[PDB]
Amino acid sequence: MEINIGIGEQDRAAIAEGLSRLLADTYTLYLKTHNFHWNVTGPMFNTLHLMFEGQYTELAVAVDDIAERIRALGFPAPGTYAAYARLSSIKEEEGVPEAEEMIRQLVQGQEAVVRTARSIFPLLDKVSDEPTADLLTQRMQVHEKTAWMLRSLLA
Amino acid sequence: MEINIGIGEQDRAAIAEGLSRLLADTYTLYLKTHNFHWNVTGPMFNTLHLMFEGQYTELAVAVDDIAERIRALGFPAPGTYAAYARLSSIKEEEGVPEAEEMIRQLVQGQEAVVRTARSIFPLLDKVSDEPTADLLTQRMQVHEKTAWMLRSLLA
Amino acid sequence: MEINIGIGEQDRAAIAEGLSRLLADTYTLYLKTHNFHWNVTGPMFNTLHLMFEGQYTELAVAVDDIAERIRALGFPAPGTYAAYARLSSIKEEEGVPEAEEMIRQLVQGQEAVVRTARSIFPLLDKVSDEPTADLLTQRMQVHEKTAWMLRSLLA
Amino acid sequence: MEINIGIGEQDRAAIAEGLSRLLADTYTLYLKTHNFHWNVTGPMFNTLHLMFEGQYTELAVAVDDIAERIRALGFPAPGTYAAYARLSSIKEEEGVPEAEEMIRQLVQGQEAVVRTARSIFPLLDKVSDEPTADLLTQRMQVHEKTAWMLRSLLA
Amino acid sequence: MEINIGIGEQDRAAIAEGLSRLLADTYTLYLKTHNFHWNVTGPMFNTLHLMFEGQYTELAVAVDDIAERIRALGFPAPGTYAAYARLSSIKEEEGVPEAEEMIRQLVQGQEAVVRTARSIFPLLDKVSDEPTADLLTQRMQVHEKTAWMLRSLLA
Amino acid sequence: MEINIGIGEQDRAAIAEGLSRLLADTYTLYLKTHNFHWNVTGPMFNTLHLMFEGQYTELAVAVDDIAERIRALGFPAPGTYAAYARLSSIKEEEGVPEAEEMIRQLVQGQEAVVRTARSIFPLLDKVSDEPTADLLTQRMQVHEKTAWMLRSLLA
Amino acid sequence: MEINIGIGEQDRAAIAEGLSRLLADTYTLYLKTHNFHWNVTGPMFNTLHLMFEGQYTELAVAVDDIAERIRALGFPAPGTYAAYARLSSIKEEEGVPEAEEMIRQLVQGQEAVVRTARSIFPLLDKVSDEPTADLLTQRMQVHEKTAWMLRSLLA
Amino acid sequence: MEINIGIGEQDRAAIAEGLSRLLADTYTLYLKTHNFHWNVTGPMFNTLHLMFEGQYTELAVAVDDIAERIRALGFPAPGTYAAYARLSSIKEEEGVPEAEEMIRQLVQGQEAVVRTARSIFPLLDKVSDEPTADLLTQRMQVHEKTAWMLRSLLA
Amino acid sequence: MEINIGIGEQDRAAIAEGLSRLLADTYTLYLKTHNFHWNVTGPMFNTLHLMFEGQYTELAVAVDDIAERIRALGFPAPGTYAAYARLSSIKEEEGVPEAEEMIRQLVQGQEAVVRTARSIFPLLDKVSDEPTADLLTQRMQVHEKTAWMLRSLLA
Amino acid sequence: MEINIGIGEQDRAAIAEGLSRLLADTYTLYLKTHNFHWNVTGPMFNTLHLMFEGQYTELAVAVDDIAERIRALGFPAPGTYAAYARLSSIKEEEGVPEAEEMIRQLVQGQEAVVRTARSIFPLLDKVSDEPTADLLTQRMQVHEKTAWMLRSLLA
Amino acid sequence: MEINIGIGEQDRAAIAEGLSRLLADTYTLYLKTHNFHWNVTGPMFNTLHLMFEGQYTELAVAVDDIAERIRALGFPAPGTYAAYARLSSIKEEEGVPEAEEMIRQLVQGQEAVVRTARSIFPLLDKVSDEPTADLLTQRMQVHEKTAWMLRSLLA
Amino acid sequence: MEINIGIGEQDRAAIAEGLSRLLADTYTLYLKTHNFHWNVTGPMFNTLHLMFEGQYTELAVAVDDIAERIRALGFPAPGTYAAYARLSSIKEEEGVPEAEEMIRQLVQGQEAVVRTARSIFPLLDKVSDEPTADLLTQRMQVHEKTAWMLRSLLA
Ligand SMILES: [Fe+2]
Ligand SMILES: [Fe+2]
Ligand SMILES: [Fe+2]
Ligand SMILES: [Fe+2]
Ligand SMILES: [Fe+2]
Ligand SMILES: [Fe+2]
Ligand SMILES: [Fe+2]
Ligand SMILES: [Fe+2]
Ligand SMILES: [Fe+2]
Ligand SMILES: [Fe+2]
Ligand SMILES: [Fe+2]
Ligand SMILES: [Fe+2]
Ligand SMILES: [Fe+2]
Ligand SMILES: [Fe+2]
Ligand SMILES: [Fe+2]
Ligand SMILES: [Fe+2]
Ligand SMILES: [Fe+2]
Ligand SMILES: [Fe+2]
Ligand SMILES: [Fe+2]
Ligand SMILES: [Fe+2]
Numbered sequence A, B, C, D, E, F, G, H, I, J, K, L: 001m002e003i004n005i006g007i008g009e010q011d012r013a014a015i016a017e018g019l020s021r022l023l024a025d026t027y028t029l030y031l032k033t034h035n036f037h038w039n040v041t042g043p044m045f046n047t048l049h050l051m052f053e054g055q056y057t058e059l060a061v062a063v064d065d066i067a068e069r070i071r072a073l074g075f076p077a078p079g080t081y082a083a084y085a086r087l088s089s090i091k092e093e094e095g096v097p098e099a100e101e102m103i104r105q106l107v108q109g110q111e112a113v114v115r116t117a118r119s120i121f122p123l124l125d126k127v128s129d130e131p132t133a134d135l136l137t138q139r140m141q142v143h144e145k146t147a148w149m150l151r152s153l154l155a
C-alpha cells in the first residue's frame, strides 16, 4: 500500500539514513553502558552499577522508538553488529577501564548521540518532518541530562 | 476575564477553526475504529478486535486533548453529529467491509488526520503558538506509527 | 456456522433492532456528556467537569457492551453518525447552554435511555432472552442513579 | 442447623440437581479448553493459545461459583471424573483436531452450557430462586459472548 | 425537577418503604457483625475475627447501595438509631455470647435479610422495577452464601 | 490468663468506660455523616457527597481502633443501638436539613468528639496509659482538622 | 519443522509418557483439592476452605507447566477424564469425608505425586534432560512442603 | 570536563539566565498556589483546596525540571528567597484575599509565566536549543490549560 | 560533628542504654515468634503459622526502628547474640512446646517488652526526649494489642 | 462559626505563632535541600542527589501538615518569601558549597528545626494542645533521624 | 580481595569462557529477535510483533544474568560487537526475510543456544559448579519452550 | 501421621542436621548484616546502609525457606541464640569496625555460607534429595553473587 504522510520517497529515505546513524549510536551506547554496568569496580560500584542500569534500561526503550520511526517512514530498521559498526560514531571499549574513565567515556557517548541528532536537523528543516524532529529533541534532552549527571561525578 | 496568552482573538479563532476540523476527523476515525472493532470477522478477528480497541482507546484521549486545547484558546469545542459531519474529511462506512478493506480504510483514516494536522502549521508559523504545534506533532507521530502497523498487515 | 442459543433468527433480529436504538441513545448521550464536560463554565466548573468525565467514561464502556450483545445475537452493530441520528431519541444540543440547563438536559438524557430500555422488555418476556434483560436492567440502574446525582444539583 | 432461605428441601434438591449438570458441563468445557490451549498448532497458534487461556481462566472461576451455589442450597458439590462424565452433555475430544475444528467444538461447547442453563429456568420459575436465576443468566451471557468471538474466527 | 423513570410516585414510595426495612436489617446486621468481630474469644478467635471483618466490610458497601437506591427512587434514606430500631427485624445482642452462639445468630441474621428481601418482590412484580429486583437478588446471593459459610463452622 | 500491662484492673475499667463513650460518639457521628452523604442536595451535592464519604470512611476505621483498645484493656466493646444511644453525647438528626445546616451539625459533631476525648485524659495522668493517650491525641487531630475543612465551607 | 533439542524422538516420547502420568496425578489432586474446598465442614471450615483454595490455585499452574513441558518435548499433552483416569495413580473420593480424613487424603496425594516424580529420574539419568529434572524437583519441593503443612494439622 | 553539546558557553549562559527567571516565576507561583490552598475559604473551599493542590503538585515537578535543565547547560540553579525575589516578575500576596480574587491572581500568574517563557524563545532561535524550546512549550501548554480551568470558574 | 539536639551526652547515653534493653527484648521476641511460626503443630497450625508470621514481620521493622533511634541519639546499636542475651529479659524456649504454651509464652513476651518500655519513661520525663517517648508508646500499643489477640485464643 | 476546641483565642494565636516559625524553618530547609539536590557535584553526586531528593520530598508534606495545623487552630498560614525570611532561623546559602559543607549545613538545618520545635513545648505545657505536641514530636523524630544519616557521611 | 568460593582460578576461567559463548549467543539472538520485531510484515504482523517483543524482553534479562554469573566467577563479562561476533555461533540476518523464514530462524536460534549450554556441562561435571549448572538448565528450559511456541506457528 | 517422602528417618535427620548449620550461619550473617546496616559510617554510609538493607531482607526470606525445608523433612527447626551460636561457623563482630572491614567481613560471611552449603552435597549424593540440593544451589548462587558485589567495592 502506498505511503502518503506528506514526505516524498527520497526524503523519507534520507531521514531514515540519519535515524539509522542515530539508532546505531544509541544501540552502541546501550551495549557500552550495559558492559560498564557489569564490569565497573571500586568504591563507587554500588552507585555506578545502579546508575548505568537506569541508563541502559532507558536506552533499550529509545532503540525501539528510533527503529519504529524508521519503520513509520517506510524503511527497514537496521539491526546487526555489522550494520551498527558501519554506522556508529561511538568507538567501543574492548577492555575494562577504571571507573572514572568509564564515566568519561559515557559522557562522550551522550555527546556523540547529541552530535548525530544535530546533524539531522538541517535535512528536517528542508523537509518538515515534525515527528522526527520531536524524537531528536527528546533524545537530546535525555542525553544532555545524563551528561550532566555523569560529569558531576568527576568534579 | 480577558484572555492574555500572547495571541489575539481572531488569531485564536483561526487556530480553533483548524483544531475543530482536526477534532472532527479524530472523532470520526474513533467511531469508525470502534465500529470495525465490533464488526470485523474472519481468521484475523482476535488480533484486529484487539488492535482496533487499542486504537480507539487512544483516540478517545486524543479527542479530549484536542477539544481542551480549543477551550484553552477561548472557544467552544464542537461536539455533535451535525458539527462533526460538517467538519470531517473522513469518509464513513455504512456497511461491513471485509477485514482487509477495514484495514485499508483505517490506514487512509490515519493519513487523513495527518493531512488535516499538516494544514494548520502555516497558520501557527504566522501566529506563533508552540503548544498547538506540539499537539499537532504528537498526533502526526501517533497516526504515522499506526499507519505503519496497519499497512504492515497487508504486505 | 449456525447460531443455536435458544432464540430463533427472527426474534434475535427484533431484539437486535431494539438494542440498536439503545446503543444509539447511549452513544448520543455519551457525546453530549463529553461535550458538556468541555464546554461547561461558571462556579460549578470543577465539579461538573469531573462529574461529566466520570459519566462519559462509564458510557463508553456501556456502548461497547451493548454493541457486543448485538454481535452475540448474530447481527452487525451500527456505528456511524447517520445510523445513530436515525435511531436516537435524544435531541442534540448545538450550542453552549448554562450549567443548570446542561444538568437538566443530562437528567432528561438518563431518562430517555431508561425509556428505550423499558420499551424492549415486552419482547424479551415473549422469547426469554435473560442476558439481554440483565443488560437492560444494568443500564436502567446506572441511569437512574445518575439521574438522582444530577437532579440533586438543582434543588 | 436448619436452612431457612425461603425454598423447601425438595425444591432445593431439585435445583441442586440442575446446577450439578451445569457444573459438569462447565468443568468438561474447562478441561477441553485447557487441552486445546496446550495442543493447538498452526498459524493461529499465538491468538488461540491466548484466547483459550482467557476462556479456561474464566471457566475455573465459574466452576467455583456454581459449586458454591450448590453448597448454599444445602447439598454437596460433585467433583470427580465419574460424577462429571455421568452428568455432562459435552462429549470430550480424545485426539488433537485441526485448529478450525477446535474452534467449532468450543462454539458447540458454549451452546451446550447455554442449553443446560435454559433447561433449569422452568424449575426456578415455579419456585422463586432469584440468586440461581441470576447465576444462570450470567453464565449464558459469558457463553453467548464467547460463542460470537469464536465463530467470528471461522467466517 | 420531575422524576420520569417509568414508576409512579405512589409505587416508588412503596418500594422505598420496603428498601427502608432492608436497609435497617442490613445496617443492624452490620453492627452486630462488627460487635462480634471485636468481642469473640476462644480458639476460633483468629478465624472468626477475620471472617466477621470481611462480612461487615461487605455490608458497609451494601448499606450504601441500598440507601442510594432509595434516593434514585426519589425519597430520603433513613439513617438513625431510632429509624433503624423501628424498621429492623433483627434482634440485637446486648451481651457477649459464646463463639458458637455468635455464629448461629449471624446465620439467622443472613436469613432475616433474605426474608425481608423476599417480602418486597410481589410489589416489584406488579410494578416492573427491574433495578431494585436485581439489587434484592444480589443481597440474597451474598446472604445465602454467607449463611452456608457460617453454618459450615457448626457441623 | 491474667492481664499484666502495668495498669491495674480498676484503672483499666475506668479508661474503658471513657473509651466506651468515645466509641459511641464516634459511631454516632459515623452514622450521621453517612446519612448526610446520602441525603444532602443542592449545588454542593457533588463536593459534599464526596467529602462526607471520606469522613465516614475514616470514622469506620476509628471505630474499630477505639473498640480494639477497649479489648486490649480487658473489657468488652459496646456495639448496639441501645448502648450507643445511652453512651453518646451526639444528637442525631431525624430529618433532612439544608446543606449548610448539615455542615454546621458536622462541625459541632467534631467538637463534641474532641470534648469526649479531652474528658478521658485526666484518667491517664494518674496511670500512665501512653497508648490510650496517643489514640485520643490522634482523634483530636483528625476531628480538629475536619472541623476546619467543614467550617471553611461556611465563611 | 524438525525438533533438534539434543534428545532423540523415542527418548523424548519416554519422558513425555512419564510426565503424562505426573500430569494426570497432579490434575486428579487438583480436582480432589477443589472438591474438598467446596465440601469440607466443621470448625476448621474457614482455614481449610482457604488452605485448599491456595493449593488448588497452585496446582492449576503446575498442570499448565507440566503439560507445556510435554509440548516442548514434541508430544501432545493428554487432557480428558478418560486419559487422566487411566494415567493417574491417585484414587478419587466419591463421597464427603470428615475434615480429618480430607486432610489425610491430601497428605497421601502429595506423597503420591512425589513418588510419580521420583519414578521418572532413572530415565532422565540415562537420557539427560536437565529442564525436566528441574521441573520434577520443583514439584517434589512443593508437594513435600504442602505435606508438612497438611500433616501438621493432625498432630 | 568540557561540555560539548553543540551550544557555546556564552549561549548556554544566556539561556540559563532566561531559565533562571522562568524558575523564579514558577517557584513564586508554586508558593502562592500552595498559600491559597491552605488559606482559601467559602463555599468553594473543597473544590479550590483540591484544585490548587493539583496545581502546586505539578509546579513542584516543573521547578525541578527547569532547574535541572539549567544544570544540563552547565550553570548553577538559583534557589534562595533572595534569588527568586530578585529574578521573579510575579508579585506575592501577603494577605488573604477572597476566593474569586485568589482565582484571578492565579490566572494572571499563569499568564505571567507564559510571558516569561515567551521572552526566552528569541534567544533559542539564534542558537538552536531544541530541548529548552520543548521545555518552554510544555510549560506554556500547562499554564494555558490551567488558565482556562481557573477562568472558567469566574464566568 | 557535634550533636546538638537538646539532650546532653550523659542523658543520651542513658536513654540509649534503656533502648538497648528494649531492642534486645524485641529481637529476642522476634526470634521466638519466628521459631514458633516454624514449629507449631496441631489443629491450629494454619492460623498460628499465619498469626506468628504477621507478628515477626512487624517485629523485624520495630527492631530496625529501635536501633536507628539509638543511632540518632549518637550511640552504636547492639547487634549480636551475646549483647542481646546479656540485655534481654525474655527467656528463650529451647524446645517445642504445645501450641497453647507457645501462645502463653508469646503473651508474656508482649508484656515483657511493655514492662521494659515503662521502665524508661521516668528518664525521658526528666529530660524531655519526646521522639523516644513516642517510640515507646507505639511499641506499647502494638504489644498490648497483640497480647489481646493472643490471649483471646486461650479462653 | 465559633471555634470550640478547648483552647482559647489568645493561646491558639500564640501556638500559631510558634508553628509559623516552625513552618518558616521547614520551608527554608526544604528550599535549601532542593537547591543542594540540584547543585551538588563530586564523587558523591549520585548518593547526595538522591538523598536530598528524599529529604525535600518529605519536607514538602511536612510544610502542608504544619500549615494545616495553623489553619485548624483558626489562623491564616503564612506563605510568602517575606514572611518566611522574617520568621526563619535558618540562614540561606547563596553560593554553591563543596559537598561536605552542604552536608554540614543540612545537619545544622535539621537541628535548627528541632530547636524551634523545642522552643514551643513550654507554651504547650501551659495550654494543653496534644495534637500540636504530637506534630512537633513527629518533626523532631524525622529531623533527628535525618541528622544521624547526614552526619554519618562525614566520619 | 581473594575469591574463595571453592573453585580454582583457571577452572573459573574455563567456566567463564563457556558462559561468554552463551552470553554472545544469547545477545545475538536478542538483537535478531529485536530486529525481526521491527521488520516483520504480513498478516501475522500483530501477533509476531508482540511475540518477538516478549522474547527479546526475556532475553535482555537473561543477558544480564549470564554476564553477572561471569562476574561472580571473577572474570570480566564481554560486551562489544567484536567480542560477540567472535564468540557467537549464531549467524545474523542482514536482510528482511519473509515472516515464516523469520520464525524458522528464531527456532534455529533457540536450538543453537541449547547446544551451547549443553556444551558446557562436561566442564561442570569435572569441576562442580551447581549455580552455573542451574543457570544453564534455566536457559535450556526457556529456549525449548520458546522453540515449541515458534515451531507451532509453522505446523 | 507417618512421613512417606522416599527418604528414611535417619537420612532425613542427617539432612536436617546439615540444614540446621546452614540456617545458623544464614541467621548469624543476617544479624551481622543488620548490625552493620545500623552502625556503618563514613562517606559510603548511604550506599552501604542501602546495600546491607537489601542483603538482610533477602536473608530473612532465606532463613524462613531453610527452616521450612527442615520442617518438610520432619524435624524441628532450631531457633534460639544458644542453638545458633552452637551450630554456626560464622563469628560475630562485637564492636564497630571501619566500613572497609565491614565489607570484608561480609564477603567472608558469604563465602562461609557457600562452604557450609557445599559441605552437605556428599550426603545428598548418597541419599538423593533433589529439593534440598536445589535449595543449596540457590543459596550458593545468591551468596556468590553478593560476594562479587561486596568485593567489587574494595577493588
Ligand atoms: Fe544487577
Ligand atoms: Fe517495539
Ligand atoms: Fe515534545
Ligand atoms: Fe492579525
Ligand atoms: Fe471486546
Ligand atoms: Fe477532559
Ligand atoms: Fe511532547
Ligand atoms: Fe510532541
Ligand atoms: Fe479534563
Ligand atoms: Fe469491545
Ligand atoms: Fe444484574
Ligand atoms: Fe449483573
Ligand atoms: Fe501458556
Ligand atoms: Fe471457592
Ligand atoms: Fe470460595
Ligand atoms: Fe446479573
Ligand atoms: Fe482487627
Ligand atoms: Fe455512597
Ligand atoms: Fe445481578
Ligand atoms: Fe447485578
Ligand SMILES: [Fe+2]
Pocket: E068
Ligand atoms: Fe456514592
Ligand SMILES: [Fe+2]
Pocket: E037, E053, F064, F068
Ligand atoms: Fe478490627
Ligand SMILES: [Fe+2]
Pocket: F134, F135, F137, F138, J134
Ligand atoms: Fe499520635
Ligand SMILES: [Fe+2]
Pocket: F134, I134, J134
Ligand atoms: Fe503518633
Ligand SMILES: [Fe+2]
Pocket: G008, G010, G011
Ligand atoms: Fe534411546
Ligand SMILES: [Fe+2]
Pocket: D037, D053, G064, G068
Ligand atoms: Fe499455558
Ligand SMILES: [Fe+2]
Pocket: G134, G137, G138, L134
Ligand atoms: Fe529448581
Ligand SMILES: [Fe+2]
Pocket: G133, G134, G137, L130, L134
Ligand atoms: Fe535441580
Ligand SMILES: [Fe+2]
Pocket: J068
Ligand atoms: Fe490538604
Ligand SMILES: [Fe+2]
Pocket: H064, H068, J037, J053
Ligand atoms: Fe531532581
Ligand SMILES: [Fe+2]
Pocket: B134, H134, H137, H138
Ligand atoms: Fe512537548
Ligand SMILES: [Fe+2]
Pocket: I064, I068, L037, L053
Ligand atoms: Fe534500617
Ligand SMILES: [Fe+2]
Pocket: H068
Ligand atoms: Fe533528579
Ligand SMILES: [Fe+2]
Pocket: H037, H053, J064, J068
Ligand atoms: Fe494540603
Ligand SMILES: [Fe+2]
Pocket: I134, J134, J135, J137, J138
Ligand atoms: Fe507522633
Ligand SMILES: [Fe+2]
Pocket: K010, K011
Ligand atoms: Fe582444573
